[PDB]
Amino acid sequence: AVINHDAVPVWPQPEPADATQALAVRFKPQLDVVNGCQPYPAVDPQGNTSGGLKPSGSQAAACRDMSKAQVYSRSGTYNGYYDIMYSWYMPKDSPSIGIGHRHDWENVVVWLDNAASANIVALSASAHSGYKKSFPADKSYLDGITAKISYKSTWPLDHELGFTTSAGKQQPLIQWEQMTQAARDALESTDFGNANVPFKSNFQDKLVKAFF
Ligand SMILES: [Cl-]
CA-based R_g, the chain, Å: 16
Q: Which is it for strands 142-143 and 130-134: parallel, antiparallel or unpaired?
A: unpaired
* Ligand 1 centroid to residue 9 C-alpha, Å: 22
- Can you tell me the distance from the alpha carbon of 48 to that of 4, in angstroms, rounded to the nearest whole number? 10
Strand 146-153 relative to strand 159-163: parallel, antiparallel, unpaired? antiparallel
CA distance 10 to 4: 13
Which residues face 50 on adjacent strands? 3
Residues 133 and 163: their CA atoms lie apart, in Å, by 9
CA–centroid distance, 175 to ligand 1, in Å, is 28
Q: Give the number of other Cβ atoms within 10 Å of residue 174's Cβ.
A: 22
Whole-angstrom CA distances from 88 to 100, 135, 140, 177 are 18, 22, 22, 16
What's the rounded Cα separation, in Å, for the pair 176 and 7? 21
Note whether 71 and 198 are within 8 A (CB).
no
CA 82–ligand 1 middle distance (angstroms): 37
Q: Distance, CA 55 to ligand 1 centroid (Å)?
A: 8
- Resolution for the entry shown, Å: 1.9
Rounded CA gap, 69 and 67, in Å? 5
Contact 168, 31 (CB under 8 A): yes
Question: Does 160 count as an annotated binding residue?
Answer: no
Are 46 and 182 a contacting pair, CB within 8 Å? yes
The pairing of strands 130-134 and 120-127 is antiparallel
Residue 72: phi and psi, rounded to 5, are -115, 155
Cα-to-centroid distance, 41 and ligand 1 (Å) = 19
| C-alpha 129 to ligand 1 mean position (Å) | 21
Measure 36 CA to ligand 1 centroid, in angstroms. Answer: 17
Domain regions of the chain by residue span: 1-212
Q: How far is the CA of 119 from the centre of ligand 1 (A)?
A: 42
Residues sharing a CB contact under 8 Å with residue 45, sequence separation 6 or more, in sequence order = 11, 179, 180, 182, 183
Question: What distance in angstroms lies between residue 195's CA and the mean position of ligand 1's atoms?
Answer: 12
Query: How far apart are the CA of 176 and the centre of ligand 1, in A?
Result: 27
Q: Is 143 annotated as a binding residue?
A: no
- Rounded distance from Cα 102 to ligand 1 centre (Å): 6
At 31, which amino acid appears?
Answer: L
Which among 132, 130, 134 has a CA at the least distance from the CA of 121?
134
Supply the DSSP string of 112-163, one letter for each residue. ES-TTT--EEEEEEEETTEEEEESS--GGGEETTEEEEEEEE-TTS-EEEEE
Q: DSSP secondary structure string, the chain?
A: -EE-GGGSPP-PPPPPSSHHHHHHHHTPPEEEE-SSPPPB--B-TT--EE----TTS-TTTT---GGG--EEEEEEEETTEEEEEEEEEEEEEEEETTEEEEEEEEEEEEEES-TTT--EEEEEEEETTEEEEESS--GGGEETTEEEEEEEE-TTS-EEEEE-SS--B---EEEGGGS-HHHHHHHHH--BTTB--TTSTTHHHHHHHH--
> Could you give the C-alpha distances from 104 to 62, 72, 92, in angstroms and in order?
14, 13, 6
Q: Is 93 annotated as a binding residue?
A: yes
d(CA 64, CA 68): 9
Non-local (6+) Cβ contacts of 144 within 8 A are none
C-alpha 189/C-alpha 137 separation (Å) is: 34
Query: Which amino acid would we find at residue 100?
Result: G
For 166, list phi and psi in degrees, rounded to 5: -80, 140
